[PDB]
């Protein structure tokens, strides 16, 4: 829960910088109907960015509400049913991945055969 | 599978990562910079050249050299980047004189990372790399002198400047003061050893100012006044005086042409016929004059400016050839005399007078 | 005209520099001949200060002309960057309104972020 | 030079007069002040730098014996490393004005006898000392010492 | 050939009757070699999960040529680490490799060569990821050596190394990854923060307790993260001023 | 205080030269604004990573919950891809049968 | 033209420099000789400063004369919008460059299909610029477009795309027959010379290098921009060793982002 | 006469020279010798 809220909070900061870059590109291209279209794109980008800032302050407050262990005590120097759930889903998509590999190999072989047979007809 | 011959690959990699340091060792020894030799650094998988004493400097006091050489701790060179021809020197200083509003308010060891890449001719350890390093160290010294004077004068400062400006960035290569009441404008001082000058650069960083710095009209004379006497408190005084006049003068139309003479001696020229001098002075006072007249032979007139009749009476309202003597104001009467009011089209009072 | 005014003002500038340096040397030699014990003719000493301000007036004329010409040429460059006269006024009010729209969009949303 | 020469001739003619700056003031300050307005509104630290940057193999400390807080300084180092064997402590005599000159290794031949292995350490160390460039550091001596110990381990086995 | 004058090579190329058997055996050789290359790439994608490895076979083949594009990216950082990409040109008895940075290597038809090659490329990826990650997190890249030359000799290929520094000075992180003996990664603390550091009487000032003298080693298992670059990012964030 | 608010203030400071009423002024202002903006962005990411590290060492069941969720989304995404592919295969069998 | 703009701004700074240097001469002469410990040393300092100031005045006058030799020749709302537009454009260019150099995006994940008409429009747009490059699209095998880019009398490049994204390239020489017996493109061949096999390898690194994730127009445009620099093969010398020939090879490496010639052995 | 000159290209004037010699008893093994040449006709 909260350890995915930290992930969402990282993604918001990663999105804010990218969105400001896109805003500056829009302001780079704007040459004094497509006038109005660039206006709409600019205003919509600014709206989404304000939404991102509000969401970021929300995520900051949520994670800052929920520390007894200081950092640099956390790094290893040299000198229970959810685990079974993990093992279940791991075995499940192990089988799914092997079946996907068989499908992918047969598609590869069909593509290679088609290209070889069609290459030799000339 | 023993078809790799690991020993030869190891010897080739060892030569190609070690032999760049040998040319650097020779070029350091030709300029007689004392260094510990090429050493394995900490972990086994690196290399470094640590200097001991960078040769003093040229043209700074001995107080500054004793204050530098007791503040340096380490100046390692390391080799990095693809092609293995990008040196990075890591200077680390102790006892930094002044912090910044940027959060470098931590433990008093600042790290300065200089990076050098020689061209693809003139090999990886050459005369050019050490020459660039000595120029960068010279730059750090010739700005450390000014920063020492400023950090000495910081506890006894005229205390209106202490509200006017706080320090944003001191990297030992730049000094970025941020001034303004809202701290919205910024100067940046940096020694430039190509021209052997200082460079003052102006910028607007902060959400309350004009569309420009408003000292950019006087930037050349600011740079010259700083190069003549490199004192930061002098610079802050000049900015503190000339900010409120120049912020009004830059809102004039352009008809109005702004020739700055020497700093604090802006001179306005209406169209071509009319001229008016402006002297910023201390304590929010600006003295204006007539321009076209002489400061010497009163009868004679300046080459391109025709005298403005009746100028003295108009200035007196805000407060024969007696426009030639100056008339002081408040900066607030200068705001009223220059900011465009509708008429007692939005023109200025002053351009209505000259029109 | 501004190029030709610039060509007019250059030899006057060299003349003012020559007279300024020579008059500075004359006044300095006269003042050293009074200050040290020396005879010297009073003569047509031709004051220094007028030459100095004359040089400053010539530099003001030069910088005035060049700032005018630079503003004019930058003006023409951005004017070419951007045939009935009402069509001209229509696209001009269009451009002014569009730039106003960009500016107010930026200001309103940079204020909509905080405060 | 050109267009500036008569000023240069006047001023170079009139140097060494004690009333010179009076003459310059009287001839130049009223013009400038009319136009421009009125004027303006124990142990040397190089060794501490070396010792602070040494590898934790070495354990350099000052000699209890010998003169202290004076020109030259004297060091007794150590060596700790699981790979390397325990060896005699090594004695160094660092001159004052330490950079621009080479420190000296106080030789103790008698403790480098009484074993073949310490003899090999000593021979290899004197060899790398002869191989060293001039005006080397302290760390060059300490690293030739550690490399000498390593070669005398390898040559023996 | 007469008026438009031809050399020896064009003349012999016009008149060269190659039999059916040579053509069919070259086609079968290319089929088998291409199947072996696909098998080694998929075996590395199944076995090794630490960086990752991708492949994109081309649409168009000949009877004697195919092509892939092999990426090696870490799991959750596909925008940062895009610095190792390959293109293999599977001929009849040769696999010709063109790197992203202009290195051309011709392998042979054995499947041990391609395996050792891609293992060395995964080892170099584990360092270029940390370099381009320290680009993002503001850390300063002190030293970088693509094929390091000190230490133990690695069997497959050379080993790579960086060392980066914390943006506020104090901490440093050194990575040394090798294809057979991977990831000896170790931080560097400041002095006055080890406290098992045997002090010396030569240092009589407190200014030298700010240099980073000591070096401890991070045990890489038991570090939290499901990846390498994830673990590096958590390690880099742990050695930052605790902002809270 | 409250790095969010410094991020907001610096982001508004990036635009301050445009919204009011040549080249080197613009250049130095842009460089300083963008550098402070990216610096506070990196500090915010560092804060979120430190908090995630403390959660992953203190309360590790949450991490396992997120892994469960991601593997389940991988399963559903794989099945969606194979279903689209299977419909395309059946359409192509109906096409190739008609020659 | 812009050269008049630059010459006028140059000569503006020349006048300001001349005026300030003249005033600096007279200001340093106003103060008089300083003290400077040694008498010989104070004489030397005063003479040196005066000489340097005079030399700077002469240099500034000479530069003004050189610019003179080289010089050539409601409404306010519109000009205010023009100035603010150029300001916003330059500001956005700088900020966009600084921000896309340092992106913090790590993965595309959170928490190819194109009409061939669009490909033809894009590649014809690229073919309109670069008047020495002619690009001739054809589709012998399905939607995958194949391009012959001829380049001067120097190169013939066969580019094999896949959904408007470059896939394979083969560089052959001018005379070389790029056609098969039936007049189709020879997609699978080599070029009988050492030089053009090296340029095929460099072109494959070029298509591996210029990779934006999403937008492919910048990719093809940048690849053609890089490819255009090969017109100075056999004429450009290497920027590391000066010579033309290392092991009988011209400098085959046009470096990305700064199109300079190198022998690939000189990296 | 069985040697291999490996020129370093990032820094020329540096050669690693591999000399291959026959080990006397083992007829199917080689012995390598690595030299480090430097070079300025
Ligand atoms: Zn070359």
CA angle E164, E169, E172 (to 5 degrees): 35
- How would you classify residue E102: left for phi > 0, otherwise alpha for psi between -120 and 50, otherwise beta? left
Which of D7, D36, D37 is the best substitution to test chain C (most C C-beta atoms within 10 A)?
D7
CA angle H15, H16, H19 (to 5 degrees): 130
Partner-chain contact D52 E208, CB within 8 Å: yes
Whether the CB of F54 is below 8 Å from some CB of chain E: the reply is no
Cα(B350)–Cα(C8) distance, integer angstroms: 32
Closest chain D C-alpha to G128 CA, distance in angstroms: 57
Burial class from Cβ neighbours inside 10 Å (0-12, 13-18, 19+) for residue B326 reads middle
Locate the DSSP E strands across E179-221.
184-188, 215-217
Site of tokens 């255009």? G228
Cα(B147)–Cα(B173) distance, integer angstroms: 11
> DSSP readout, A71-106?
TTSSS-B---HHHHHHHHHHHHHHHHHHHHHHHHHH
Nearest to D61 among E202, E213, E214 (CB): E202
Whether the CB of G90 is below 8 Å from some CB of chain F: the reply is yes
CA angle E86, H5, H13 (to 5 degrees): 95
C-alpha distance from residue G17 to each of A22, B221, B261, G53, G60 (Å): 42, 9, 11, 12, 6
Nearest to C56 among D5, D13, D35 (CB): D35
What's the CA-to-centroid distance between B27 and ligand 1, angstroms?
24
Find how far residue B296's CA is from the centre of its chain: 37
Which of A26, A60, A95 is the best substitution to test chain F (most F C-beta atoms within 10 A)?
A60
| Nearest alpha carbon to residue C6 among C78, C49, C70, C51 | C70
Cα(E188)–Cα(E215) distance, integer angstroms: 5
Q: Please state, as a whole number, how many other Cβ atoms lie within 10 Å of the Cβ of residue E28.
A: 11
| Tokens, residue G139 | 């589709």
Q: Which residues partner with E141 through β-bridges?
A: E164
Cα(D38)–Cα(C113) distance, integer angstroms: 49
Tell me if there are at least 3 CB pairs under 8 Å linking chains H and F.
Answer: no
Cα(C56)–Cα(C50) distance, integer angstroms: 10
Tell me if there are at least 3 CB pairs under 8 Å linking chains A and H.
Answer: no
Which SS3 state, helix, strand or coil, does residue B35 take? strand
Taking a C-beta distance cutoff of 8 angstroms, is the pair B286, B279 a contact?
yes
Q: Please state, as a whole number, how many other Cβ atoms lie within 10 Å of the Cβ of residue E226.
A: 12
| Biggest distance spanned by C-alpha atoms of chain H | 40
Torsion angle (degrees, nearest 10) of CA B352, B354, B355, C2: -130
Nearest to A32 among C99, C105, C113 (CB): C99
Cα(E171)–Cα(B45) distance, integer angstroms: 17
Partner-chain contact F12 C110, CB within 8 Å: yes
| Nearest alpha carbon to residue B351 among B215, B244, B254 | B254
Cβ burial H2-41 (10 Å sphere, 16+ → b, else e): eeeebeeebbeebbbebeeeeeeeeeeeeeeeeeeeeeee
Taking a C-beta distance cutoff of 8 angstroms, is the pair D51, E202 a contact?
yes
Tell me if there are at least 3 CB pairs under 8 Å linking chains H and C.
Answer: no
Determine the residue of chain H that is closest to B84 in CA distance.
Answer: H10
Partner-chain contact G13 B220, CB within 8 Å: yes
Burial class from Cβ neighbours inside 10 Å (0-12, 13-18, 19+) for residue C8 reads middle
Which SS3 state, helix, strand or coil, does residue G140 take? coil
- A50 interaction partners in chain C (CB closer than 8 Å): 109, 112-113
What's the CA-to-centroid distance between H8 and ligand 1, angstroms?
13
Taking a C-beta distance cutoff of 8 angstroms, is the pair B14, B22 a contact?
no
| Nearest alpha carbon to residue E171 among E243, E81, E237, E105 | E237
Cα(D121)–Cα(E235) distance, integer angstroms: 42
DSSP state of B185: E
Cα(B334)–Cα(C85) distance, integer angstroms: 40
CA angle E235, E158, E135 (to 5 degrees): 35
| Resolution value, angstrom units | 4.4
Pairing outcome for strands B86-94 and B109-116: antiparallel
Whether the CB of G168 is below 8 Å from some CB of chain E: the reply is yes
Partner-chain contact E9 G192, CB within 8 Å: yes
Taking a C-beta distance cutoff of 8 angstroms, is the pair G138, G185 a contact?
yes
Torsion angle (degrees, nearest 10) of CA F48, F53, F56, F62: 0
Nearest to D4 among G23, G27, G58 (CB): G58
Which SS3 state, helix, strand or coil, does residue B70 take? coil
Contacts 24+ apart (CB under 8 A), E44-47: E44/E115, E44/E118, E44/E119, E44/E122
Taking a C-beta distance cutoff of 8 angstroms, is the pair B277, B289 a contact?
yes
| Nearest alpha carbon to residue A14 among F1, G102, F54 | G102
| Biggest distance spanned by C-alpha atoms of chain D | 92
Touching chains, A (3+ CB pairs < 8 A): C, E, F, G
Helices (H), chain E: 8-14, 20-47, 113-136, 229-238
Phi, psi (5° rounding) for residue F94?
-70, -30
Contacts 24+ apart (CB under 8 A), G110-118: G110/A11, G111/A4, G111/A7, G111/A8, G111/A11, G112/G163, G112/G165, G113/G163, G114/G163, G114/G164, G116/G143, G116/G145, G118/G164
End-to-end CA distance of chain A: 62
Site of tokens 């003052």? B200
Pairing outcome for strands E70-71 and E54-55: antiparallel
Torsion angle (degrees, nearest 10) of CA G219, G221, G224, G226: -70
Site of tokens 């100035």? G83
What's the CA-to-centroid distance between G235 and ligand 1, angstroms?
13
DSSP state of B333: H
Q: Identify the H or E element spanning A114.
A: helix A81-119
Touching chains, E (3+ CB pairs < 8 A): A, B, D, F, G
| Nearest alpha carbon to residue E126 among E49, E53, E71, E73 | E73
Cα(A56)–Cα(A50) distance, integer angstroms: 10
Locate the DSSP E strands across B13-67.
49-50
Whether the CB of E7 is below 8 Å from some CB of chain G: the reply is no
Q: Please state, as a whole number, how many other Cβ atoms lie within 10 Å of the Cβ of residue E8.
A: 7
| Tokens, residue G155 | 């190169």
> DSSP readout, G60-120?
HHHHHHHHHHH----HHHHHHHHHHHHHHHHHHHHHHHHHHHS-----S-------HHHHH
Taking a C-beta distance cutoff of 8 angstroms, is the pair G13, G70 a contact?
no
Closest chain E C-alpha to B130 CA, distance in angstroms: 18
After what residues is chain A interrupted, C–N > 2.5 A? 32, 66, 79
Partner-chain contact F28 B186, CB within 8 Å: yes
Which SS3 state, helix, strand or coil, does residue B147 take? helix
> DSSP readout, B255-295?
-EEEEE-STT-EEEEETTTEEEEEEE-SSS-EEE--SSB-S
Tell me if there are at least 3 CB pairs under 8 Å linking chains D and H.
Answer: no
| Nearest alpha carbon to residue G168 among G181, G156, G159, G179 | G159
Cα(A121)–Cα(G266) distance, integer angstroms: 45
Phi, psi (5° rounding) for residue E12?
-70, -30
What's the CA-to-centroid distance between G198 and ligand 1, angstroms?
14
Helices E20-47 and A81-119, axial angle in degrees (round to 10): 160
Which of B278, B296, B300 is the best substitution to test chain C (most C C-beta atoms within 10 A)?
B296
Count how many pairs of residues, chain C against chain D, have C-beta atoms within 8 Å: 58
| Tokens, residue C109 | 């949303």
Phi, psi (5° rounding) for residue F7?
-65, -45
- Give the neighbor-by-neighbor strand order of the sheet with D91-94: D61-62, D73-76, D91-94, D104-106
Site of tokens 């340091």? B21
Partner-chain contact B120 G23, CB within 8 Å: no
Pairing outcome for strands B197-204 and B185-192: antiparallel
What's the CA-to-centroid distance between G263 and ligand 1, angstroms?
4
Nearest to F34 among G84, G99, G104 (CB): G99
């Amino acid at each position: 829960n909260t350890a995915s809220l930290c992930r969402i909070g990282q993604e918001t900061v990663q999105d804010i910088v990218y969105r400001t870059m896109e805003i500056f590109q829009l302001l780079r291209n704007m040459q004094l109907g497509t006038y109005q279209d660039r206006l709409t794109k600019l205003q919509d980008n600014l709206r989404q960015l304000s939404v991102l800032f509000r969401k970021l302050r929300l995520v900051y407050d949520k994670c800052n509400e929920n520390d007894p262990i200081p950092v640099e005590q956390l790094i290893p120097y040299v000198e229970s049913e959810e685990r079974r759930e993990i093992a279940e889903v791991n075995k499940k998509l192990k089988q799914k991945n092997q079946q996907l590999k068989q499908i992918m190999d047969q598609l590869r072989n069909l593509i290679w055969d088609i290209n070889a047979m069609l290459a030799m007809r000339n | 599978m023993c078809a790799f011959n690991k020993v030869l690959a190891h010897f080739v990699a060892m030569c190609d990562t070690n032999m760049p340091f040998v040319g650097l060792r020779l070029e350091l020894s030709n300029l007689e910079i004392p260094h510990q030799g090429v050493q394995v650094e900490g972990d086994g998988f690196s290399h470094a050249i640590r200097l001991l004493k960078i040769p003093p400097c040229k043209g700074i006091t001995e107080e500054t050299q004793k204050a530098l050489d007791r503040s340096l701790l380490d100046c390692t060179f390391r080799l990095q980047g693809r092609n293995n021809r990008t040196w990075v020197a890591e200077l680390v200083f102790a006892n930094c004189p002044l912090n910044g509003t940027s959060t470098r308010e931590q433990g008093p060891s600042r790290h300065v990372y200089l990076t050098y890449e020689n061209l693809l001719s003139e090999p990886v350890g050459g005369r050019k790399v050490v020459e660039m390093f000595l120029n960068d160290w010279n730059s750090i010294a010739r700005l450390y002198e000014c920063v020492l004077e400023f950090a000495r004068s910081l506890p006894d400062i005229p205390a209106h400047l202490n509200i006017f400006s706080e320090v944003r960035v001191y990297n030992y290569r730049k000094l970025i003061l941020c001034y303004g009441t809202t701290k919205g404008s910024s100067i940046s001082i940096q020694w430039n050893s190509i021209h052997q000058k200082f460079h003052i650069s102006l910028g607007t960083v902060g959400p309350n100012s004009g569309c420009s710095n408003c000292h950019n009209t006087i930037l050349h004379q600011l740079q010259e006044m700083f190069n003549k006497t490199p004192n930061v408190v002098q610079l802050l005084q000049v900015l503190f005086d000339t900010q409120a006049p120049l912020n009004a003068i830059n809102k004039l139309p352009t008809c109005f042409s702004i020739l700055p003479q020497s700093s604090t001696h802006i001179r306005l020229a209406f169209r071509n016929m009319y001229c008016i001098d402006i002297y910023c002075r201390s304590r929010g006072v600006v003295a204006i004059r007539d321009g076209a007249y002489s400061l010497f032979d009163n009868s004679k007139l300046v080459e391109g400016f025709y005298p403005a009749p009746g100028l003295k009476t108009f200035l007196n309202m805000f407060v024969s050839w007696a426009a030639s003597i100056p008339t002081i104001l408040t900066h607030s009467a200068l705001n009223i005399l220059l900011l465009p009011s509708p008429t007692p089209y939005l023109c200025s009072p002053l351009e209505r007078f000259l029109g | 005209d501004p190029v030709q005014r610039y060509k007019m003002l250059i030899p006057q500038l060299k003349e003012s520099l020559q007279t300024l340096m020579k008059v500075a040397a004359q006044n300095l030699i006269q003042n050293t001949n009074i200050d040290n014990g020396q005879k010297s003719s009073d003569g047509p000493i031709q004051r220094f200060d007028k030459c100095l301000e004359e040089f400053y007036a010539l530099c003001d004329q030069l910088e005035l002309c060049l700032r005018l010409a630079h503003e004019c040429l930058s003006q023409s460059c951005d004017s070419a960057k951007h045939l009935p006269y009402p069509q001209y006024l229509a696209v001009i009010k269009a451009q002014i309104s569009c730039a106003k729209d960009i500016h107010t969009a930026l200001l309103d949303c940079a204020n909509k972020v905080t405060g | 030079q050109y267009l500036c020469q008569p000023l240069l001739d006047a001023v170079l003619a009139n140097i060494r007069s004690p009333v010179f700056n009076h003459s310059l003031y009287r001839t130049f300050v009223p013009a400038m002040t009319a136009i421009h307005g009125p004027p303006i509104t124990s142990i040397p630290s190089v060794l501490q730098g070396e010792v602070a940057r040494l590898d934790p193999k070495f354990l350099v400390n000052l000699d209890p014996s010998h003169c202290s807080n004076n020109g030259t300084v004297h060091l007794i180092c150590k060596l700790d490393d699981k790979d390397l064997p325990s060896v005699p402590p090594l004695e160094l005599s660092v001159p004052a004005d330490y950079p621009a000159q080479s420190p000296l290794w106080i030789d103790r031949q008698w403790q480098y006898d009484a074993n073949p292995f310490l003899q090999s350490v000593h021979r290899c160390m004197t060899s790398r000392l002869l191989q060293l460039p001039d005006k080397h550091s302290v760390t060059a001596l300490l690293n030739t010492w550690a490399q000498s110990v390593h070669q005398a381990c390898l040559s023996a086995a | 050939s007469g008026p438009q004058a031809f050399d020896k090579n064009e003349i012999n190329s016009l008149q060269s009757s190659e039999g059916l058997l040579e053509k069919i055996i070259k086609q079968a050789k290319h089929i088998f070699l291409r199947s072996r290359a696909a098998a080694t790439i998929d075996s590395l994608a199944s076995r090794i999960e630490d960086p990752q490895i991708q492949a994109h076979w081309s649409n168009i083949n000949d009877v004697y040529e195919s092509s892939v594009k092999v990426l090696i990216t870490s799991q959750g950082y596909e925008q940062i680490c895009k610095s190792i990409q390959l293109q293999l040109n599977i001929g009849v008895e040769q696999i010709r490799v063109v790197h992203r940075d202009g290195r051309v290597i011709t392998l042979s038809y054995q499947e041990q060569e391609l395996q050792d090659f891609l293992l060395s490329q995964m080892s170099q990826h584990q360092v270029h990821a940390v370099q381009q990650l320290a680009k993002v997190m503001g850390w300063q890249v002190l030293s970088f050596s693509n094929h390091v030359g000190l230490g133990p000799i690695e069997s497959i290929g050379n080993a790579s190394a960086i060392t980066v520094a914390s943006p506020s000075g104090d901490y440093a992180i050194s990575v040394r990854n090798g294809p057979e003996s991977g990831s000896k990664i170790m931080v560097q603390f400041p002095r006055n923060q080890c406290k098992d550091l045997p002090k010396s009487d030569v240092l009589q000032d407190n200014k030298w307790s700010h240099l980073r003298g000591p070096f401890k080693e991070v045990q890489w298992n038991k570090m939290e993260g499901r990846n390498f670059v994830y673990k590096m990012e958590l390690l880099m964030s742990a050695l930052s001023p605790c902002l809270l | 205080s409250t790095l969010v608010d410094e991020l907001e203030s610096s982001f508004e400071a990036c635009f301050a030269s445009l919204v009011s009423q040549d080249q080197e002024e613009i250049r130095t202002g842009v460089d300083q604004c963008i550098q402070k903006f990216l610096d506070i962005a990196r500090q915010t990411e560092c804060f979120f990573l430190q908090k995630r590290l403390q959660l992953s060492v203190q309360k590790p069941e949450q991490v396992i919950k997120e892994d469960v969720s991601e593997l389940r989304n991988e399963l559903q995404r794989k099945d969606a891809l194979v279903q689209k592919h299977l419909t395309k295969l059946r359409h192509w069998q109906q096409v190739l049968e008609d020659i | 033209v812009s050269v008049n703009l630059e010459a006028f701004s140059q000569a503006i700074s020349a006048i300001q420099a001349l005026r300030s240097s003249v005033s600096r001469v007279f200001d340093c002469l106003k103060d008089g000789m300083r003290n400077k410990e040694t008498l010989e040393g104070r004489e030397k300092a005063f003479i040196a400063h005066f000489q340097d100031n005079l030399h700077s005045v002469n240099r500034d006058l000479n530069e003004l004369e050189r610019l003179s030799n080289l010089v050539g020749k409601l409404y306010s709302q519109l000009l205010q919008a023009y100035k603010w537009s150029n300001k916003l454009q330059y500001h956005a260019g700088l900020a966009s460059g600084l921000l896309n150099q340092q992106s913090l995006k790590r993965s595309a994940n959170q928490m190819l299909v194109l009409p061939p008409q669009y490909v033809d429009d894009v590649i014809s747009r690229i073919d309109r610029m670069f008047p020495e490059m002619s690009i001739h699209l054809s589709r012998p095998n399905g939607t995958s477009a194949m391009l012959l880019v001829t380049l001067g009398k120097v190169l013939k490049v066969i580019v094999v795309m896949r959904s408007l994204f470059i896939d394979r390239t083969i560089v052959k020489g001018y005379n070389e027959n790029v056609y098969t017996e039936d007049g189709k493109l020879d997609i699978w061949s080599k070029s009988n010379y050492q030089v053009f096999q090296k340029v095929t390898d460099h072109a494959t690194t070029a298509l591996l290098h210029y990779q934006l994730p999403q937008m492919p127009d910048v990719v093809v445009r940048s690849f053609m921009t890089w490819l255009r620099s090969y017109i100075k093969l056999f004429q450009a010398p290497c920027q590391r060793c000066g010579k033309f020939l290392q092991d009988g090879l011209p400098p085959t490496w046009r470096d990305f982002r700064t199109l300079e010639a190198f022998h690939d052995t000189c990296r | 006469k069985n040697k291999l000159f490996i020129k370093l290209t990032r820094l020329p004037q540096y050669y690693i020279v591999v000399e291959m010699l026959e080990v006397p008893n083992k007829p199917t093994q080689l012995s390598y010798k690595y030299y480090f040449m430097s070079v300025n006709p």
